[PDB]
Each structure stands twice: as C-alpha cells, then as structure tokens.
Amino acid sequence: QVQLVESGGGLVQAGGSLRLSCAASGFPVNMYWMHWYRQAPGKEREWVAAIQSYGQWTAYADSVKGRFTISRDNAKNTVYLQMNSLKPEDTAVYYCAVGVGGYYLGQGTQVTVS
Amino acid sequence: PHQLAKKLSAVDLVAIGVGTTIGAGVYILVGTVAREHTGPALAVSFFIAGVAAALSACCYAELASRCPSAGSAYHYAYICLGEGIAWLVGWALVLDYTIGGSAIARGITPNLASFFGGLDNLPVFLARQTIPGVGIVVDPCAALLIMIVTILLCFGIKESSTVQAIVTSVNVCTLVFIIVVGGYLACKTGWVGYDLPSGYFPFGLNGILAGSAVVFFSYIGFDTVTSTAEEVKNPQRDLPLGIGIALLICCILYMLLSVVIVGLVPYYSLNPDTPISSAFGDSGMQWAAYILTTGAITALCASLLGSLLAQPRIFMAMARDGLLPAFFSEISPRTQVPVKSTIAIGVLAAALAFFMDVAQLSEMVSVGTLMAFTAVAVCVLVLRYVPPDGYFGKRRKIAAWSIALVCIGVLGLASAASAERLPSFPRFTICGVSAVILLGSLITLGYIDEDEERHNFGHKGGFLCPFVPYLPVLCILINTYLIINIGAGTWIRVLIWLLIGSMIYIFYGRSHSLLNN
Ligand SMILES: CCCCCCCCCCC(CCCCCCCCCC)(CO[C@@H]1O[C@H](CO)[C@@H](O[C@H]2O[C@H](CO)[C@@H](O)[C@H](O)[C@H]2O)[C@H](O)[C@H]1O)CO[C@@H]1O[C@H](CO)[C@@H](O[C@H]2O[C@H](CO)[C@@H](O)[C@H](O)[C@H]2O)[C@H](O)[C@H]1O
Numbered sequence: 150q151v152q153l154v155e156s157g158g159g160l161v162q163a164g165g166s167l168r169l170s171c172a173a174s175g176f177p178v179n180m181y182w183m184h185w186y187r188q189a190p191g192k193e194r195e196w197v198a199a200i201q202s203y204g205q206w207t208a209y210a211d212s213v214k215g216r217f218t219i220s221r222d223n224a225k226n227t228v229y230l231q232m233n234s235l236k237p238e239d240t241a242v243y244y245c246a247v248g249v250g251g252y253y254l255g256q257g258t259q260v261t262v263s
Numbered sequence: 264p265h266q267l268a269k270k271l272s273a274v275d276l277v278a279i280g281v282g283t284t285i286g287a288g289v290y291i292l293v294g295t296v297a298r299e300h301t302g303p304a305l306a307v308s309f310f311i312a313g314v315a316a317a318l319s320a321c322c323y324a325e326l327a328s329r330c331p332s333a334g335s336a337y338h339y340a341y342i343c344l345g346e347g348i349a350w351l352v353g354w355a356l357v358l359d360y361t362i363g364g365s366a367i368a369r370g371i372t373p374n375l376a377s378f379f380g381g382l383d384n385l386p387v388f389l390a391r392q393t394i395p396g397v398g399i400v401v402d403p404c405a406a407l408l409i410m411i412v413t414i415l416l417c418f419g420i421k422e423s424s425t426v427q428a429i430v431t432s433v434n435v436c437t438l439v440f441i442i443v444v445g446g447y448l449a450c451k452t453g454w455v456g457y458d459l460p461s462g463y464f465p466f467g468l469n470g471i472l473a474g475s476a477v478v479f480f481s482y483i484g485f486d487t488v489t490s491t492a493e494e495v496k497n498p499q500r501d502l503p504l505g506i507g508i509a510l511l512i513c514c515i516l517y518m519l520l521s522v523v524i525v526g527l528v529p530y531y532s533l534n535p536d537t538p539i540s541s542a543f544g545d546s547g548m549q550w551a552a553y554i555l556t557t558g559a560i561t562a563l564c565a566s567l568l569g570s571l572l573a574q575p576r577i578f579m580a581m582a583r584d585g586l587l588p589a590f591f592s593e594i595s596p597r598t599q600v601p602v603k604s605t606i607a608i609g610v611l612a613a614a615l616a617f618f619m620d621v622a623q624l625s626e627m628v629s630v631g632t633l634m635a636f637t638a639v640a641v642c643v644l645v646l647r648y649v650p651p652d653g654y655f656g657k658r659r660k661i662a663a664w665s666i667a668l669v670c671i672g673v674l675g676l677a678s679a680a681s682a683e684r685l686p687s688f689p690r691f692t693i694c695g696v697s698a699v700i701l702l703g704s705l706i707t708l709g710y711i712d713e714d715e716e717r718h719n720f721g722h723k724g725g726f727l728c729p730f731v732p733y734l735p736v737l738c739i740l741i742n743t744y745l746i747i748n749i750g751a752g753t754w755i756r757v758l759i760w761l762l763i764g765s766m767i768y769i770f771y772g773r774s775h776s777l778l779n780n
C-alpha cells in the first residue's frame with residue numbers, strides 16, 4: 150500500500166543547510182504530487198513545498214520561497230527537500246505528503262537549530 | 264443521383280461534434296496532464312482552451328455558413344490562400360484525422376479484450392503476436408474495429424450518424440451520471456479533498472496557460488462537423504449553432520469532470536478513510552473504476568466512429584476539384600455517400616493501426632489540424648477584407664500586403680517567444696521588430712474598412728466572426744505558437760508526409776486539374 154518513510158532531520162548549526170529524504174513505497178513516486186509539511190510544538194501544521202507529479206515544477210510557501218529546494222529521484226523513489234539557508238523560524242517537525250492535497254502523511258522527523 | 268443527401272440535422276451535428284471532441288478529451292484526461300495540474304487549475308485551463316477553440320470555431324463557422332462545402336479547410340484555403348496551399352492543408356488534415364482514428368482504435372483494442380474493465384477473453388489468432396523477424400520489432404494487432412467503422416460509414420450518413428448519436432448520447436449520459444456521483448460524494452465529504460495547501464492555480468496564469476497549451480487539442484471536433492457540411496439540410500443556420508453548442512457542451516463537461524472526478528482521483532486513492540468504500544462498502548473503487556472505464560471506452564468509441572467520416576469528404580472535394588483521381592469522387596448510387604474513397608481511407612487506417620503502435624501514431628497527429636485552423640483564420644481575414652473576386656484604388660493591394668505582414672509578424676514573434684535556445688541579445692531585436700511590424704499591419708488593416716463585396720461571397724447572410732480585425736489574428740498567433748511548440752519528432756514525419764503529398768501533386772494534380780487545365 151502507499152507508505153512514506155523520511156530521514157535526514159537533526160540538530161544543525163545556525164545558518165547551515167539540510168536535506169530531508171522521504172522514501173516512497175507501494176507506488177511510483179512519479180504519479181502523485183508530493184508536498185512537505187511543518188509543525189512546531191506551539192503551532193498548527195504549516196505547508197512547506199510541493200513538487201508536481203508529472204514534470205518537475207515546484208512551488209513554495211511565502212515564508213520559505215527560494216530558501217528550500219525540493220527534488221525527486223524516480224529510480225530510488227525518494228523525494229528530497231533541500232534547505233539551503235536555515236533559521237530558527239523553521240525549527241519544527243517535517244512531514245512529506247502524497248497527492249494534490251494532504252491525503253497521506255508520513256511518520257515524521259524533527260529538525261532543530263543551534 | 265450523384266448528390267449527397269442533406270439528411271443531417273442540427274442535433275446530429277451537435278452529437279457528432281461532442282462525440283469527436285469528448286473522445287480526445289477523455290484520452291487527455293487519462294493522460295499525464297490530468298495529474299499534472301490541480302483540479303480547479305485544470306478546469307480553468309480547459310476554459311481558456313475552450314476560448315481559443317471558440318476563436319478558431321468562429322472562423323470555421325463563418326466560412327462554413329457563408330460557403331458550405333465538404334472540402335472543409337481544404338475548400339477554404341483553396342478559395343482565399345489559393346490552390347497548392349490547399350493541397351497541403353487538405354493532405355495534412357487527411358493524415359491528422361486518419362492517424363487520430365488509427366491511434367484511438369489501437370488504444371481501444373487492448374483494453375476492450377472483454378466487455379469492460381480491461382478483462383481478457385483470451386481470443387485465438389486475433390491477439391497481438393509480434394512479427395518474429397530477425398531484427399523486426401513490429402507488434403501487429405487486431406484492427407477489425409476500423410473495418411467495422413468503415414462499414415458503418417459506408418452504410419450512409421443517417422445510419423452512421425444515428426449510430427454515432429446513440430453511442431455519444433450513451434457516453435454523455437454516463438458522464439453526467441459519473442459527474443453527479445462525484446459531486447454527491449464531494450458534498451457528502453464536504454469537498455475536504457480540495458483543502459489544497461498551495462491553493463488553486465499554484466503556478467499562476469503561467470501554469471494555466473501551460474496546461475491550456477496541451478489541453479487545447481481536446482477541442483478538435485468542430486473541423487469534422489464542418490467536413491460533414493454537405494449533409495446538413497440548411498447548413499447556414501445549423502453549422503454555426505451546432506459547432507457553438509458542441510464547444511460549449513464539451514467545455515462544460517471538461518470543467519465539471521476536471522473539478523469533480525479528475526482533481527479528486529488522488530483523493531479517493533490516498534486518503535486512509537477511503538470515502539468511496541465508506542460510501543459504497545466493500546466494492547469501493549472496483550465499481551467506480553468499472554464505471555470510469557465504461558465512460559472512457561464509450562467516449563473513445565464515439566470519437567473513433569466520428570473521425571473517419573471526414574477524410575472521405577476531403578478526398579471527395581479534392582477529386583471533384585481535380586487533384587485526385589475520379590476514383591475518390593464518385594459516390595454510391597444507393598447510399599449517397601463516398602463508398603470507394605471511404606473504403607480506401609478505411610483500409611489505410613486499418614493498415615496503419617495494424618502496423619504502427621499507439622505510442623508511434625500519437626507522434627504524428629497534432630500538426631495537421633493546427634495548420635487547418637491557421638489557414639481558415641487567414642481565409643476569414645482575406646475573404647472579409649480582400650475577397651479574391653471582382654477612397655483608395657490601392658486599397659486591395661495595401662490590405663493584401665497588410666495581411667501578409669500580420670502573417671509574417673505572428674510567425675516572427677511566435678518563433679522568437681518560443682525559441683529560448685537563441686541568445687537574448689538578438690532575440691530581443693527579432694521579437695521587437697516582428698511585433699512592431701505586426702502592430703503597424705494591424706493598424707493599417709483596421710484603418711482600411713471591410714470590403715462591401717463580402718456581401719457576395721458564398722451566400723448572403725450567415726454567421727460572421729465577432730472581431731474580424733483582432734480575433735482572426737489572435738487565432739493565427741495561438742495556432743502558430745502551438746505549431747512551433749510541437750517538437751521535431753512530429754515535424755520530421757509531417758515533413759516527409761507533406762513531401763510525399765507535394766510529389767503526388769507535381770506528378771499529377773497540377774498537370775490535370777480544373778481551373779488550371
Ligand atoms: C471519463 C473519465 C476519464 C478519467 C477518469 C480517471 C482515470 C484515471 C484514474 C484511474 C483510477 C480512478 C479511480 C476513481 C475512484 C473513484 C472516482 C469517482 C468515480 C465516480 C463515478 C482507476 O484505476 C483503475 O485501476 C487500474 C490500476 O492499475 C488503473 O490503471 C492505470 O490506468 C491509468 C494508466 O495510465 C492511470 O490513470 C491509473 O492511475 C493507473 O493505475 C486503471 O485506470 C483502472 O482500471 C485510479 O484507481 C486507483 O488506482 C490506485 C493505484 O494505486 C489504487 O490504489 C490503491 O491500490 C494500490 C494497489 O493496487 C495500493 O498500493 C494503494 O495504496 C491504494 O491506494 C486505487 O485503489 C484505485 O482506485
């Protein structure tokens with residue numbers, strides 16, 4: 150069935166960069182949109198980025214546009230979210246979501262800054 | 264007598280147009296673009312594509328109502344643009360319709376192994392058996408569907424038209440049921456599937472135009488309706504109304520499907536609560552998939568029936584004028600319909616679908632219809648301003664040069680704007696000069712008023728495009744951009760096909776042809 154596992158998040162120095170890898174399962178990664186979601190302990194969910202199922206167009210939220218790069222690997226069926234410039238604003242748990250909207254949500258991972 | 268029977272009716276034209284259009288529409292919706300764009304974005308892309316197709320259909324309807332004739336864009340290009348350019352427009356249109364029908368049949372056959380749902384009946388000696396050549400990869404397939412469709416078309420215009428009407432009405436009813444079910448389910452779940460984070464139109468008009476670029480080829484059915492103009496009792500009234508109602512119904516259906524079923528197909532597949540199963544129990548998507556496959560297959564069959572009824576008409580017009588042997592001209596004394604030309608086109612399409620794969624047939628189809636549209640646009644511009652018959656005495660020549668300049672400028676700026684491989688420094692100059700000459704030509708064209716002899720061409724009355732100075736130019740620009748966007752893969756094949764056409768023309772068609780012999 151459709152299942153999403155992601156890794157890469159962890160403690161990093163302020164102003165650094167990160168890449169989060171979200172591995173698909175039970176379906177080719179090409180056939181659905183893939184989004185990313187955020188949520189700090191004191192806030193509700195916050196959409197991050199959204200690749201396009203067919204073709205490789207990407208869109209980002211206002212607070213993060215340009216900073217993050219979302220890519221995809223059709224061979225390994227993995228979706229990568231690259232953080233070029235981090236700041237404490239983004240300190241939160243990260244999720245990767247399938248479908249045009251938030252239909253399925255991954256297990257999750259945590260990222261923090263120092 | 265040797266005359267086509269004017270037995271068709273406005274409802275029958277609407278049915279033909281809607282079926283032929285909906286087939287390609289469902290072919291696209293099953294394709295890659297459907298999941299490329301969001302639901303609402305896909306719907307507005309279909310809306311813009313429908314607006315552009317209406318820009319083309321206004322010219323089609325005007326030229327068909329004023330001078331109705333089975334030649335379609337061939338006949339029109341032959342009167343305004345002149346001979347030669349017609350033989351290239353008509354030849355390209357023939358290739359386009361033939362390869363559309365062949366691709367539709369080749370796609371239908373494997374999925375139609377059983378009644379519906381893609382099940383297999385395990386036939387013998389009709390299944391796909393690759394040719395065991397030493398280095399040959401062809402995979403011949405059952406192409407009997409083309410033979411049955413050709414037999415239907417050869418059986419008359421009312422009989423084939425009635426069968427097409429039955430199939431397309433069944434398709435439209437199942438599509439309406441399919442939309443009602445989708446809307447009921449969405450309202451039951453409160454449209455929760457459309458809580459899009461990025462929001463609708465996530466890529467802005469940039470995407471809505473990018474999507475509409477590939478969604479434009481879903482409205483390619485009105486040209487067939489024009490091709491069947493001779494069968495209409497009073498084409499002056501029906502043809503424009505029929506074409507309009509067909510592009511309206513198709514646009515509405517596409518937007519509805521795109522917002523209710525397509526934009527939510529991911530939702531029904533991914534969401535763990537599975538509203539389809541929760542609403543219909545264990546069966547769940549299994550019956551929904553069956554219904555969607557039924558609708559798609561009915562639409563594809565309707566378009567397969569519709570497509571092959573244009574080429575015989577084009578061939579009949581060509582032979583009647585003289586660019587093809589009289590073998591294509593004569594009609595059945597009993598059925599009052601091209602039977603020899605229809606049989607030839609049917610056997611050609613059958614062979615093409617038998618040998619070439621669908622993935623190969625789809626790589627050659629798109630170019631003909633765009634050229635037909637561009638030709639018909641230039642034709643309204645030339646028949647409403649400088650009709651080729653009969654304040655300023657130089658008005659005719661200045662108008663002709665102005666039209667030539669708008670035809671050159673559209674090409675220039677549509678190839679500049681669609682050529683990112685060129686460096687920006689000369690790209691800016693070329694686009695600017697093309698644009699300025701286009702603007703100047705448009706200003707001159709508007710300054711010179713419409714020729715009043717336009718009251719004479721064809722028959723008086725009929726439909727006339729809304730904005731003759733700007734709408735046809737917009738249609739030309741759109742079609743030229745679409746043509747240039749098409750990759751070289753389809754262009755090489757259409758070039759060799761047109762070369763074959765020019766060979767036939769120079770060896771026979773120029774030496775023997777009415778109005779030139
Ligand atoms: C006129 C309109 C024309 C266009 C219509 C849309 C056509 C495109 C969508 C096709 C469709 C519509 C379902 C609609 C549901 C109800 C909607 C409302 C109906 C109202 C009346 C029917 O898909 C059917 O199933 C085939 C499956 O291969 C599919 O194949 C291919 O065909 C095309 C090849 O290019 C291509 O499009 C299509 O995607 C392809 O799969 C066929 O299209 C079709 O037979 C999708 O079905 C969904 O497929 C999911 C695949 O994962 C499946 O996932 C589940 O099972 C997985 C294990 O299998 C498991 O791992 C997943 O975790 C789980 O989630 C869903 O259960 C299933 O529902």
Ligand SMILES: CC(C)CCC[C@@H](C)[C@H]1CC[C@H]2[C@@H]3CC=C4C[C@@H](O)CC[C@]4(C)[C@H]3CC[C@]12C
Pocket residue numbers: 206207466468469470472473475476744745
């Ligand atoms: C027939 C006509 C209307 C088609 C016009 C197509 C135009 C609008 C297309 C062609 C190439 C497209 C661009 C290609 C890639 C990208 C990068 C992506 O991250 C955002 C969208 C953007 C910037 C696209 C916007 C739309 C675009 C400019």
